[PDB]
Amino acid sequence: TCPFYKKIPGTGFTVDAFQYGVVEGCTAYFLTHFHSDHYAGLSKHFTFPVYCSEITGNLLKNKLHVQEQYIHPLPLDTECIVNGVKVVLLDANHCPGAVMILFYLPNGTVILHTGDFRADPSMERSLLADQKVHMLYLDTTYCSPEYTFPSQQEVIRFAINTAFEAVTLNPHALVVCGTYSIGKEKVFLAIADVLGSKVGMSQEKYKTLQCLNIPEINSLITTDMCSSLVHLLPMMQINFKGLQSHLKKCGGKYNQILAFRPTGWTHSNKFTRIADVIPQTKGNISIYGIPYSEHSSYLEMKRFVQWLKPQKIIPTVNVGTWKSRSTMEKYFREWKLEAGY
């Protein structure tokens, strides 16, 4: 049944709770972003109201075929009323259209649900600053000290330099970038740009990207593989057999592949620096796994919480084992003691 950490007390609301059938007492279903663990269960046959961002609404309409009459998109940074309750949607710095949700309960309690987020100091100057938050529903994906990773800007720098060098040395080298959901678009767009190319992709993927309100997007992507020297593939195909297969399909236009797998975390981060990353190579094919994260590092998460000083924290990730739960509750206690709230 629907777990308690997906229910917002004092309202008829649930968040990201689309795979439990009809939730007893739910009058509005919020969707934080268009990733499958979160939208799981939505479909063209859904007949309850869905509240979400404009971009997430484009994707529900065009990709899931949810009927328009049930999609209620809201603008960001704007006080809105939903079934009698004031709410605000904030940018979650996750994938395109991802939001956090502020709920202002009738009784005076204020709740922040983060959705999936990558905490950032810039959040400390949104409408969050303007009042106290009593309860926090927190994306705890990387809530452990071993999870360090570099900034997004450092990772992109590394990829840009790597690709530019390889292709300048060998003009017949193809670059391939793996994808399986929205998010991490900067990886392939930044590379394409330094190489003066468009990104070539399948029709389904091109459609997906046309939902995202990315400016000048028509200048940046295409369905014509032949005209483009950065290709996107399913993440499943980013391996030697899969890439060898694809090279055969390009008809002798290229003789080398450089490929990128944007990973979350990988234990090489406990020792090695970004400057010091190396690929896996077989023949004329090389694969880089790069730690481009759209979730908070441990330190980013800790800083956010210590700034916010909530009265209660409810984890939404890693909640399935007692050992995880217990480990997370200890870190929360340390943070609260260290900061004094």
In the complex, the residues that contact Ni ion under the rule CB under 5 A are 35, 116
- Smallest gap from Cβ 25 to Ni ion, in A, equals 26
DSSP single-letter state for residue 146: T
Q: Closest distance between Ni ion and the C-beta of residue 302, in Å?
A: 20
Question: CA quadruple 330, 334, 340, 341: dihedral positive or negative?
Answer: negative
Minimal distance, residue 140 CB to Ni ion, in Å: 13
23 with 8: CB under 8 angstroms?
no
- What minimum distance in Å lies between the beta carbon of 301 and Ni ion? 15
Indicate the residue among 246 and 295 with the shorter CB distance to Ni ion: 295
Tokens of 149: 């990773």
Q: Which tokens is 122 given?
A: 């810039």
| Nearest residue to the partner Ni ion, using Cβ | 116
Least Cα distance to 328 among 311, 339, 313 occurs for 313
CB closer to Ni ion out of 116 and 185 = 116
Nearer to Ni ion, 180 or 341 (CB): 180
Gaps in the chain (C to N over 2.5 angstroms) fall after none
Amino acid at 41: G
Q: Are strands 285-291 and 280-282 parallel, antiparallel or unpaired?
A: antiparallel
Looking at the Cβ atoms of 116 and 300, the one nearer to Ni ion is 116
Triad 222, 224, 227: Cα angle to 5°: 95
Q: Smallest distance from the beta carbon of 16 to Ni ion, in angstroms?
A: 10
Which residue stretches of 149-297 are H helix? 152-169, 185-194, 203-210, 240-248
Neighbours of 26 (CB within 10 A): 19
Nearer to Ni ion, 128 or 139 (CB): 139
- Nearer to Ni ion by Cβ, of 181 and 268: the residue is 181
- Rounded Cα gap, residues 137 and 133, in angstroms: 11
Q: Which is nearer to Ni ion, 31 or 163 (CB)?
A: 31
Q: Is residue 284 within 8 Å of 164, Cβ to Cβ?
A: no
Q: Min. distance of Cβ 77 from Ni ion in angstroms?
A: 21
Minimum distance between the CB of residue 207 and Ni ion, rounded to whole angstroms? 20
CA distance 151 to 146: 16
